[PDB]
């Protein structure tokens, strides 16, 4: 899920004091946080409202950012970027959701003979670039990364 969250960051600078050290600090803020990720509260994708970032040695920098964090039970749409005997990955925002072969209908089976690799049944063909609706069955949170495992077994899931 995408959210806008109020965040904070303490930065330390006496070699760079100046009438426009504020732009410098905003710069370090972007380098330090934008594009970062924690299992705690997800991906800090984009710092917002650059012109008004609140800045108060060390300075407490209060800012807002668009953040992404998956949650168990969340249903999302995405694109298949890879298949293997173990299953396929779905690109969802900045994250890859891995659907294991055991979380797919049993009639869906890997075609180790196709290219690109794919899973198929009596009706659908899931391969690279396929649009798909999946359910996040679990999120594994590491110190600086988040992992999602998904399923397309239930009703209303699968090929879009």
């Amino acid at each position: 899920m995408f959210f806008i969250k109020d965040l904070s960051l303490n930065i330390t600078l006496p070699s760079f004091f100046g009438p426009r050290m504020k732009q410098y600090l905003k710069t370090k803020l972007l380098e330090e946080v934008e594009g970062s990720c924690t299992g705690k509260f997800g991906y800090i994708l984009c710092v917002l409202d650059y012109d008004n970032i609140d800045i108060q040695a060390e300075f407490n920098v209060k800012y807002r950012a668009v953040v992404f964090k998956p949650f168990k039970g969340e249903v999302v749409d995405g694109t298949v970027v890879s298949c293997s005997q173990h299953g396929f990955e779905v690109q969802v925002g900045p994250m890859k959701v891995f659907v294991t072969k055991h979380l797919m209908p049993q009639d869906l089976t890997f075609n180790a003979g196709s290219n690109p690799p794919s899973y198929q049944s009596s009706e659908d063909v899931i391969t690279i670039k396929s649009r798909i609706r999946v359910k996040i069955e679990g999120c594994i949170s590491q110190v600086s990364s988040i992992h999602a495992i998904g399923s397309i077994k239930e009703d209303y899931l699968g090929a879009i």
């Binding site: 995408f2 969250k5 732009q23 972007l30 934008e34 594009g35």
Partner: protein, 136 residues
């Protein structure tokens, strides 16, 4: 408070944030279709981002491909429609992102909706969302 965004809002919010940042950068500097979207984004990111932010880049293409409502007006209409339901932000966000054809589908995909709204009202909402869907 809890601010959850649907995909289309996230897209507009990020784009707007970067456009303004590009402008802030220019002012400080020393003086002297949906496919064009993907191209524009690459340029915008090159000009505003730390070059190695693949998370943001992946997010942008994702949002360009899955955003159901493309303009601020439409997005504004969608947010108004959903808030007037009294549903929780997490449900409003999913409902504004996941296109659903029936009450059963939506209630099945978003279980917390089960007992907060009737099928009839939800059906009426799905229709309105559908009707606001950018045909571009």
């Amino acid at each position: 408070e809890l601010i959850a965004l649907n995909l289309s809002e996230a897209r507009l919010v990020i784009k707007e944030a970067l456009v303004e940042r590009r402008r802030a950068f220019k002012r400080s500097q020393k003086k002297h279709t949906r496919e064009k979207e993907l191209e524009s984004i690459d340029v915008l990111l090159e000009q505003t981002t730390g070059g190695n932010n693949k998370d943001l880049k992946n997010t942008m293409q994702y949002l360009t491909n899955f955003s159901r409502f493309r303009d601020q007006e439409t997005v504004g209409a969608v947010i108004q429609l959903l808030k007037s339901t009294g549903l929780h932000p997490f449900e409003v966000a999913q409902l504004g992102s996941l296109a659903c054809d029936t009450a059963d589908e939506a209630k099945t995909l978003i279980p917390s909706l089960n007992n907060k709204i009737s099928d009839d009202e939800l059906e009426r909402i799905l229709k309105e969302l559908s009707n606001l869907e950018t045909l571009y």
